[PDB]
Structure formats: structure tokens, C-alpha cells
Design a protein around this nucleic acid. Structure first.
Ligand SMILES: [Mg+2]
Ligand SMILES: [Mg+2]
Ligand SMILES: [Mg+2]
Ligand SMILES: [Mg+2]
Ligand SMILES: [Mg+2]
Ligand SMILES: [Mg+2]
Ligand SMILES: [Mg+2]
Ligand SMILES: [Mg+2]
Ligand SMILES: [Mg+2]
Ligand SMILES: [Mg+2]
Ligand SMILES: [Mg+2]
Ligand SMILES: [Mg+2]
Ligand SMILES: [Mg+2]
Ligand SMILES: [Mg+2]
Ligand SMILES: [Mg+2]
Ligand SMILES: [Mg+2]
Ligand SMILES: [Mg+2]
Ligand SMILES: [Mg+2]
Ligand SMILES: [Mg+2]
Ligand SMILES: [Mg+2]
Ligand SMILES: [Mg+2]
Ligand SMILES: [Mg+2]
Ligand SMILES: [Mg+2]
Ligand SMILES: [Mg+2]
Ligand SMILES: [Mg+2]
Ligand SMILES: [Mg+2]
Ligand SMILES: [Mg+2]
Ligand SMILES: [Mg+2]
Ligand SMILES: [Mg+2]
Ligand SMILES: [Mg+2]
Ligand SMILES: [Mg+2]
Ligand SMILES: [Mg+2]
Ligand SMILES: [Mg+2]
Ligand SMILES: [Mg+2]
Ligand SMILES: [Mg+2]
Ligand SMILES: [Mg+2]
Ligand SMILES: [Mg+2]
Ligand SMILES: [Mg+2]
Lengths: 101, 87, 116, 70
RNA sequence: GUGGGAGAGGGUGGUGGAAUUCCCGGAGUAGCGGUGAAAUGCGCAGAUACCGGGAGGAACGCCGAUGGCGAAGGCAGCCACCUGGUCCACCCGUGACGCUGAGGCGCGAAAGCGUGGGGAGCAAACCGGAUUAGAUACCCGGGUAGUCCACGCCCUAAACGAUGCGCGCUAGGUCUCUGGGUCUCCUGGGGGCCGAAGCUAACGCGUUAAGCGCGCCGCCUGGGGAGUACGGCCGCAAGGC
């Protein structure tokens, strides 16, 4: 099990009924693929650099997990299925390389 | 791939004595494991030609060591081959 | 018949012609002109003189719809590309700003033999 | 002119999510600045270019922009 | 062995924006395009130029380098999985296990061939317009095979560093990529430039040798005829050795 980082951006128009559902869906999808969650960071409404799905904003999520490596490409396939989900970029974790230190 | 956990397990199995990392039996035991990792990777991925070249050098290195063990002590050679299922 | 009074202007400059469109702030055009609309026919269309006259013709057509303030967009390199701009600032239309939006690919399509 | 690394702090060159600092390395357009302008090293610029491209896919840095001049 | 390191090395899947083409709608008149000038072409069934939406295929701008990786061919968006080679530090282990390599086997840009897909842009042949003494061409408008993908053939090249491989030895200076170090620098392993001794017909090479040596393989013996004829082997063919 290596350690990865999950970037999820979804439609910034959801109310709490749909926001809780969409996220508890993300919870359900990580349980079924075996991802032990280490910490979470939720940014929310953020100005985008270019339109994505005709929409000028995006609601951002970030999880750091530890999971089996073989199941990663299938985990990405499961998250993109949701219509409200827009960007799913999973990157293997790395050390904080410092510059001008 | 091949983690150091699986690495230590093989060296402690084919070490002629505690602490031996470079015996001919150890190298061939190590080479033979990377052979099986690659031959299973090349059953699928039949179009991976540049990895097929490294496998040729590993086999030639394995035979080169086995041809050496053959000349010096032919008994440990039979003990090694029967223990690895080669030839 | 529209009374827009503010909008955008697109200068499309090539080595063979320079053409000017004038639109409302939403992009939908009002009038336009080119080097062929004015009397010029052949290679004279891609000349800085023709580029100037073409700019001034559109700028006078937009006066009929009541244009005063203009934002300018420029696409392409070619003779008279700058001459059209300079023709536009003095056209009476107060020029709000000038942007260069010339489309450059990220190396996607094979060019004709000429461009290689 | 000053260089980007010359006027900056101690920052994470691998973080694709800090847009405030990575905006300093894009030009007026969305383009990545040359080494002569960023004042980075060989290994640093190679890392920056990759974290820039990542931030571009997250909709945080622009692929290209519009020049206001000429 | 251990612990670290860099990378367009490879294969698989996924994925992102710019641009081209085409469709849909909005808006909008008379031409666009192209050249040394033009003309075929396209345009009132409403094009070009502008805004929005949709589709499809191919290629990756800036970063980008005189740079990196690979045995050569060759390898540039991003992410993940599988994976190859290589380098440094420690001086731990085995104890000459080495080098080369006729055959054999595997790889092999582009073009070409077979079966089935795909087909946006480009574009042999070909269809036209010009040019011209003539145009079977350079320039212009179209355009099929092909270029892309899957599977299997083909085996050539300015496949070039026109320099086979490995090792040892023989002044330095400077620029650089990447490691380690007591980090004006020292020390390795690659990539450039000047140049000691020396070699060379000369240009030039010169610790990345074309120098001084040693081991092994390939190859040469005047030009045309000619990489032709014959024979053989390989190939579906073209054709190859
Ligand atoms: Mg979706
Ligand atoms: Mg013209
Ligand atoms: Mg790669
Ligand atoms: Mg690849
Ligand atoms: Mg239409
Ligand atoms: Mg007609
Ligand atoms: Mg007509
Ligand atoms: Mg007609
Ligand atoms: Mg189609
Ligand atoms: Mg470049
Ligand atoms: Mg190299
Ligand atoms: Mg590796
Ligand atoms: Mg020792
Ligand atoms: Mg001993
Ligand atoms: Mg060899
Ligand atoms: Mg051979
Ligand atoms: Mg081939
Ligand atoms: Mg081919
Ligand atoms: Mg074919
Ligand atoms: Mg064409
Ligand atoms: Mg043509
Ligand atoms: Mg003549
Ligand atoms: Mg004729
Ligand atoms: Mg067609
Ligand atoms: Mg020789
Ligand atoms: Mg250092
Ligand atoms: Mg060196
Ligand atoms: Mg001399
Ligand atoms: Mg020299
Ligand atoms: Mg030498
Ligand atoms: Mg000589
Ligand atoms: Mg011969
Ligand atoms: Mg003769
Ligand atoms: Mg021949
Ligand atoms: Mg004969
Ligand atoms: Mg024959
Ligand atoms: Mg036959
Ligand atoms: Mg031939």
C-alpha cells in the first residue's frame, strides 16, 4: 500500500441534500476499494482559471489515503461516473521539495 | 515489484551461512526471482520489446554463473538446480 | 436601428487581406467591411492603405447604429494590421482597449507544404 | 529586472495547489517563463514545469491568456 | 548486498486544453480565398469574419536546451499500473566467475503488402487553373492510396560520430547534466568547446583518441560494366542477403 492524494472538483451549485449525498457517495466508494483515510482538506468555492463545464467556479476536495496500488485506476473509474463530479486527479504522494530554502 | 521484504526472505533461504549476500547460489536465487517477475510481465504486454532485452541479459548472467558452479563443485550445482526447478 | 453605443471590433489581418467586423458586447456583429468591400480587388487588398480604408468604412457604418466606445481585438500578422488599429483610434470612436487574440495551436494539425 | 526566485520565500516547488505563488511564474499569457526570468536551477525548473501543468489540469492555472497591448 | 539518485527508456489503461475540419443555432452583407501578377475554386440554397453549442480524428505550444534517456532504430500534454537499463556512497559478501564473438536467435525510421477498422488535417497518383518556346515541374485550387489503431509480413538508409567492442596508459583550461563530499572547491559518471606530447597526405584528432599498446570480430585490393547476370536462400508481392 502506497500513499496517494485525491483531488475532487464538483459542481458548485449543490444544496446540502445533494452535497451530503455526493460526498457520502465518495465515502462509500473509498470503503469498497480499501482506502484508509489519513487526513482531509476541503477548500470549497474557488475561482477557476478557465471554464469547466460552462461553469466559472469549482468546489474542491482533497484526501490523503493509503490503499493498494493495483486498484487505483479502477477507483478513478468509479468516481468519474457521478455526473456532479468533474475533475478527478490522483497523484502518488511525494516529499515537500524546498526551493530557495 | 520486488520489495526488500521479499528480498530478505530469499537471501536468508539460499545463504550458505549467516551474513552471506554474494554467494553464487544467492545471485542465481535472486536472478531467478526477477526472471519469474518479468516472464509473467511478458506473458501479458507481448509488445514490450525494450524490457525483453533485459531478460536476455539476466538469463545469460544466470547461465554464466551456473556454468561456473558446474566446473568447481558439481554437487551444489545439482542441489541448486533441483531446488529452483531449472534445466 | 439598434442603438448599441458600445461594443467590440475584430481586426482579422492576413498577408492577403485585412477585414474588420464590429459587434455588440455579446459578440453578435453589427456591420463589417474589408479590402474587397472597398474598391480594391487583387493583391492591393492586403496593403496597409486598404487596411486603413476598411477600418474607416466599418467605423462610419457603426456610427449609424450609434457606436461611441469600442474594444478592439486583433487576429493575425500581416501588412496593415497596425495601420488598421491606428486608423481606428482616430476614427472618432474612443478606443477602450486593445487585445491580441491570435489563435496559436499547441501543435495539433499538419500545415500545408507552404508553412513548413 | 528582478528574478522570481530572488523575490520570494521558502516555498514548496512540488505543490500544485498553491496558485498564489505559481501565478508568479506564468507570464502575462499562461506561458511558463524561461529560466533566465525565473532564476531557477536546472532541476528546479523541470519540477516547476510539471507542477504548473498539474495546476493547469485542476483549473487553477490558465493554459493560455490574452495580451492587452499593441 | 545495502542505502540512495535522475530520466521524452518501454508497455497498458485513462485523461486535459489550444487549434483545424464538419454539423446546429444566434447575429450579419458581397465577396472570400490565393499569387510576382492572376485564374480554376467557393459564395444569394446567405459564404468569409463574430458569439454560443455539439461531434470527430490527429498532434502535443510555452517549459525546451548548444539538454536528458536508450544498444541502435528511436523516445516530448497529464495521471496511474506493470517494467528495463544506468549512476553514486558504504568496502559487507562470492573469489577470475573475464573480453570478444563466425553461425543461430531477437530488435529494427520511413515507405510498401495482407485482413479488419478508422479517416479531422496533410497528401503520391490523378483532376483542374496558371507559368512557359513547351510544363508530363517548381507556384494555386481540389483530391485517392497512405499517414492513425489492432494483428501478421517486409529487414532496406547519408541505419552517420561516414569512426566495431572492451581494457590499460599518456599536460591542462573552460562550459554543462547528475550524484557524493570536510560544498572558494575536491571527487566520480555522462554531454560540448579550446588545446600538451604525439599521430595524420592535408583538413583535422587530441583522458568521449584518429595518440601509445594489447585481445577478438567485420571488411578493403583501379574506374566503367555492376550491386547487374547466373545460381541459391528468404518473401504473398514489391524486393532483400
Ligand atoms: Mg462526470
Ligand atoms: Mg489578395
Ligand atoms: Mg516513459
Ligand atoms: Mg510511454
Ligand atoms: Mg450557419
Ligand atoms: Mg461561381
Ligand atoms: Mg453561386
Ligand atoms: Mg453554385
Ligand atoms: Mg466523422
Ligand atoms: Mg523548442
Ligand atoms: Mg547516453
Ligand atoms: Mg525504474
Ligand atoms: Mg572486501
Ligand atoms: Mg575468502
Ligand atoms: Mg557482449
Ligand atoms: Mg551475430
Ligand atoms: Mg522495419
Ligand atoms: Mg511504416
Ligand atoms: Mg495497410
Ligand atoms: Mg490540401
Ligand atoms: Mg497540391
Ligand atoms: Mg523558358
Ligand atoms: Mg497549359
Ligand atoms: Mg474530403
Ligand atoms: Mg581497429
Ligand atoms: Mg553538491
Ligand atoms: Mg567528463
Ligand atoms: Mg605539436
Ligand atoms: Mg578539437
Ligand atoms: Mg582509446
Ligand atoms: Mg588515418
Ligand atoms: Mg562485401
Ligand atoms: Mg575492374
Ligand atoms: Mg540494390
Ligand atoms: Mg551460377
Ligand atoms: Mg536471383
Ligand atoms: Mg518463392
Ligand atoms: Mg532495390
Amino acid at each position: 500500500m502506497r500513499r496517494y492524494e485525491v483531488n475532487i472538483v464538483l459542481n458548485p451549485n449543490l444544496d446540502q441534500s445533494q452535497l451530503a449525498l455526493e460526498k457520502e457517495i465518495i465515502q462509500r466508494a473509498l470503503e469498497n476499494y480499501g482506502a484508509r483515510v489519513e487526513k482531509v482538506e476541503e477548500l470549497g468555492l474557488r475561482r477557476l482559471a478557465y471554464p469547466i463545464a460552462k461553469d466559472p467556479q469549482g468546489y474542491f476536495l482533497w484526501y490523503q489515503v493509503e490503499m493498494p496500488e493495483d486498484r487505483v485506476n479502477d477507483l478513478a473509474r468509479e468516481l468519474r461516473i457521478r455526473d456532479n463530479v468533474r475533475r478527478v486527479m490522483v497523484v502518488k504522494s511525494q516529499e515537500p521539495f524546498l526551493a530557495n530554502a | 515489484p520486488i520489495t526488500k521484504e521479499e528480498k530478505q526472505k530469499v537471501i536468508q533461504e539460499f545463504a550458505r551461512f549467516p551474513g552471506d549476500t554474494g554467494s553464487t547460489e544467492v545471485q542465481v536465487a535472486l536472478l531467478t526471482l526477477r526472471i519469474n517477475r518479468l516472464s509473467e510481465h511478458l506473458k501479458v504486454h507481448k509488445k514490450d520489446h525494450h524490457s525483453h532485452r533485459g531478460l536476455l541479459m539476466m538469463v545469460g548472467q544466470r547461465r554464466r554463473l551456473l556454468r561456473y558452479l558446474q566446473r568447481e563443485d558439481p554437487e551444489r550445482y545439482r542441489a541448486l538446480i533441483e531446488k529452483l526447478g531449472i534445466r | 436601428k439598434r442603438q448599441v453605443a458600445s461594443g467590440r471590433a475584430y481586426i482579422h489581418a492576413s498577408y492577403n487581406n485585412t477585414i474588420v467586423t464590429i459587434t455588440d458586447p455579446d459578440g453578435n456583429p453589427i456591420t463589417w467591411s474589408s479590402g474587397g468591400v472597398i474598391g480594391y480587388k487583387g493583391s492591393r487588398k492586403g496593403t496597409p492603405y486598404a487596411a486603413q480604408l476598411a477600418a474607416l468604412d466599418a467605423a462610419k457604418k457603426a456610427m449609424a447604429y450609434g457606436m461611441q466606445s469600442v474594444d478592439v481585438i486583433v487576429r493575425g500578422t500581416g501588412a496593415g494590421r497596425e495601420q488598421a488599429i491606428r486608423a481606428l483610434q482616430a476614427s472618432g470612436l474612443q478606443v477602450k482597449s486593445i487585445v491580441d487574440d491570435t489563435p496559436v495551436p499547441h501543435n495539433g494539425c499538419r500545415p500545408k507544404k507552404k508553412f513548413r | 529586472k528582478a528574478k522570481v526566485k530572488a523575490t520570494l520565500g521558502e516555498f514548496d516547488l512540488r505543490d500544485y495547489r498553491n496558485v498564489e505563488v505559481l501565478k508568479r511564474f506564468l507570464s502575462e499569457t499562461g506561458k511558463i517563463l524561461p529560466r533566465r526570468r525565473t532564476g531557477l536551477s536546472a532541476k528546479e525548473q523541470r519540477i516547476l514545469a510539471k507542477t504548473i501543468k498539474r495546476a493547469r489540469i485542476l483549473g487553477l492555472l490558465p493554459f493560455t491568456e490574452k495580451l492587452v497591448r499593441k
